[model samples]
Target: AKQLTLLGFFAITASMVMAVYEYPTFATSGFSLVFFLLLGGILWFIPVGLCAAEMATVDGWEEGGVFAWVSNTLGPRWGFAAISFGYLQIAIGFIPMLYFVLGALSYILKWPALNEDPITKTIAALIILWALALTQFGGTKYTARIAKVGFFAGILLPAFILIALAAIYLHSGAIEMDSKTFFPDFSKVGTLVVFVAFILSYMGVEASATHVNEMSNPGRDYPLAMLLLMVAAICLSSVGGLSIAMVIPGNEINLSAGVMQTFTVLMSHVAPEIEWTVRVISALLLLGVLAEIASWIVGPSRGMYVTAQKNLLPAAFAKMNKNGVPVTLVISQLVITSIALIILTNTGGGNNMSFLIALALTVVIYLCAYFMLFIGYIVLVLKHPDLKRTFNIPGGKGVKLVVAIVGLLTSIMAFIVSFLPPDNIQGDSTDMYVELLVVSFLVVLALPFILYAVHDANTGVTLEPINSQNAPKGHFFLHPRARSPHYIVMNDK
Candidate 1:
């Protein structure tokens, strides 16, 4: 891809990682959103992106994304787990996106009742969910167009509008938050809670690494692309969070529909005469998220499909259609997502709190997967010191060590902090939310082991010990006694 195309690709990936709706929730923290965004960008986002770029461009580390990178270093079992977490996280993550779609459509249809009606919301969510699933049968080429349109319409357009409107609104001298309040009080634990969400906003940037090969020049262009991706995230998120905080009171923020809500409030205040325009913009944003969800729905599942074929999972998950899409896996994702959606939306008043819990669960699962990616990076540095790469983090052993340590520590912090309810979520249901998160965390962790054990018993597939012949070229050779058979590969290979 040309530099411009790569730039667009990076922007799309960055936008996908940080949702506009999250701004309002984060904005609740006054100026802490800004601090945490910059903090997390440095500590977490850049490291993850760079590590992925290095892994992607290097020989023998060119495929499988998290799975490939981790499996190459730690062993295949970890790779299977990493990719499976990616798959499960995306599926679980879809539940909140479905709620956003519902919120968006509710705005367009002028059916405020849809937000309160569980049956309607459930039915609508399933319809949208499966509709996107069905599109996978036609394959990625078609879905790519939808994702591009979504990036422009849903994310970029709304982001620009939010920033522009906030500028206009602030200029009018009606600012609700004072400039002095921009710096948050660091002494309070509650003030720092938003850091977890900030970290998550940067979680999926590694998704872009999967496409480094598409770049016209992976070595030179990849780092430039990553820098652009990082810049876009910080700039857009700062302005986006500021805009929402300026208009919507923190207490009134709606996690699922906050972006649209901000647009609605901004329109009524700054340009009530053109208020009808919110409906149009709202519909576009809605379509934007729908397209976003549609793109992701197939992406990770396809990874899982390949891992399954490697015997990390049962053969059933590896089934694909003539289109080369994993037909069975797609359906399986839909089924599990539907079940999650139903359970999440039917419990404990089934209101915005449920949506927040669902969102938090996805974040925890995703953060775990990210933790694995960071560990994989660390292992690569320690074990494969001589591995050649098109792009490596610019630094000596000391700098790389600091980056890996910071990345790992930050990921662990975010995973733990995800359990704490943010200001926007209702506090009364904190116990229920914690319970759901605990249960969900345990389940996500166990899946890979369960699948691996099943594969071991039935198929007798096992990890091969790394040796001179099978290991990648240009890497240090280790003694046969130094390697373990705990590392796995496909049985057929």
Candidate 2:
């Protein structure tokens, strides 16, 4: 197998983590955007990236990302539960990601037919999702190139252009940053709910941990990639966001096309040939969002497939095809996601209302998974301190606890804030909005346990080998004859 290079690893991760599309959302807060971005980087992703780095480098625990990390400490049931939420969280968000593609096409081709009607939009979304979903069957090595190219094409270059263009307008004396308030006022049904976007933007660092084992030297390299990713992602998001904020004229903030809004203003001052340049920006946004969709296909899907091989899921879901891709399960995820978009596209009856509700729940569901992860990490280091790893969290146990606890509380705070729908939303749809969140959370929370229980009834096999003194350490390989474990396998020389 070809090993993942450090720069290659950063490309794949950065493609997923950075959100140039979200610049407008950040710009909404104006100067407060910096405060929230730094706050989230420090209190949220700093600990998340560090803890994921440590877990991903663990000797035998290198493969499964959240599943293996949580399983080793919390048991297979919770492993399934944690990783289930991890996958499902992105599962829900896939709608918005794909929708952005059509939205981009609308601008690029000057065609409202892309998203103007429910039927056409649903069909277009499915095509984009399936096309990207099939790309996974070719394996990550192939997808790695897509990420690298797309990162530079869509995310990296646009960010530089945004900041540099903002610089031009700044020098041209056309744009002014007169008011620079750091604190945001929580006014009216609480506009502070936008804070959740800044916090949620830094998520999914651990989802990519599944690829750690593919790297030639994960212990030395994984931490380095994560450190680079966190800093670069924050820097790009910070400055791009600041550029958008600096360029916007008044209190005008269009949620959907804020990045383009900023671009329009900047072009008028800096590059007035704004016609084709807008098309150029449109295509890049499309490519960047497509890259985002592609990066997600590998991580969480691989985690669930890996967990299932340990017998947390039914045997049918555990098989990997010749290419080493979990074809069946991934195809199933696409089918499920397709059905969701189909219904949501037609169901909302107008605008992005239904998709918005689902998007809200995605953050909350992902937070629940992070909750288990932070808790599992705190338990693992304290209880099973001797487990070997190339990289360990810096400092002693005190720092480990601090990272875990800080992340835990930060995620929890975001979780609570998610339920409080932004003031602009839920005005009349409050009943449906609140109901969907409560119901969606309950359903996502329950399905994993039900599946785990069914798997247990059929196997009656041991789940937590580390908990049993008599059993082997690390994880086990199933006995070929009886589908049972005879011994454990360690990922060591």
Candidate 3:
């Protein structure tokens, strides 16, 4: 057996159920579109994975992910900026995911599609967003517990069931594959663009990569676990994706409805006694989606938690309740999330494409985070060759150079390709000076200046950039020498 046990790796990677359902937003775009996307995913994963493996092997330290990596490599300001930007982007990712989960739940209970009436969907969506946000007050462990169960039921089981249904549909001649050709048609730039976003999803394990420090033997175990898990994830996701294209009519399909449609289609073939099976599965999925909501609730906050600990934001942002919960920040996140959900609801049927487009910001934001990480690898490996690395990449300097180059190029590609709308799902597909969204995101990010300023006025101390030489020996900003005495930074490590 390999030195690091990968059982948890398989579980964690597969447990990310949101990714599976999320991909279908592009499904209606075409299987050829998704195939091209998966190919991009494969291309992106290899070097990035190997580079991360090398970095983790050498450092084996934690500032809770790329934030720590870049901060250590670059310096305080850049690190904090990179991490802060990454947290917001990923934190933003939670809104869409939670909205979808709530929307999925509503669909299961009442068979209500949000598109049928945008107003009602908006109201229901707002309510659910607050509920999920409040749930985040439970903090990391509590949230992860939910994710664990949700992983099995919501993601793993449902995915297997979908695949099974797809298989049966094929065997029973229920599906007709139009084999004019299976070739990917990327001639249209729009198809290529959405295809890249599809690839972006596959490349995003690095947000989770920050957790490698928590692993027992990150160098040897981390690489093994990540690689092993990536394989399982790709297989499950690929089949689920292919199944949707196979079992459902391309024109009638809704990415959100793949699981539902698959079950409904299967119900037509099953006997009355066994017909209840779909409901049972749906009920299981209900709990799974709820669990998924619970899972998503904490992840973005954890990323934020890392940012708060780093002094990128203020100390209050890190405050937790008795259960080790960041109740204050969680509530604030819920408020923002509620607004996005309301926006999601008001737009109605158009929200899904908008949702996909909004997510494009996060993809760019996350890619920026990865860009920093890729550079961090280049700098660290070149500058600090003596550091002991348990899990080194296969080749010598050439391997490092190649991995760094590939990782950067793919990150840039994913970032650039994120702007295209899905090829088939066309409602409100027109852009209204879409750079406005980009500008708004930038303005929203800059609002932190006001936040930090207000925080400083109350505290009477501006955040002095800690010169690397003058910084504390540990990653914790709560050191006795920090600018303010009253602010005891939460040093979890």
TM-score of each: 0.84, 0.79, 0.79
| Residue-by-residue lDDT tens digits, candidate 2, 381-437 | 888898887667777899889878998888888777677754343222333555556
Candidate 1 residue 183 Cα shift, in angstroms, is: 5.3
Look at candidate 2 and tell me the lDDT of residue 49: 76
- Whole-model lDDT per candidate: 0.67, 0.65, 0.55
Question: What clash count goes with each model?
Answer: 2, 1, 1
What is model 3's C-alpha RMSD? Answer: 7.3
- Judging by lDDT against the true structure, name the best candidate: 1
445 Cα displacement, candidate 1 (Å): 1.2
Superior by lDDT: candidate 1 or candidate 3: 1
- Model 3: lDDT equals 0.55
Off by over 4 Å in 3: 1-3, 6-14, 37-41, 59-64, 111-115, 136-142, 175-183, 207-227, 271-277, 299-303, 422-428, 444-493
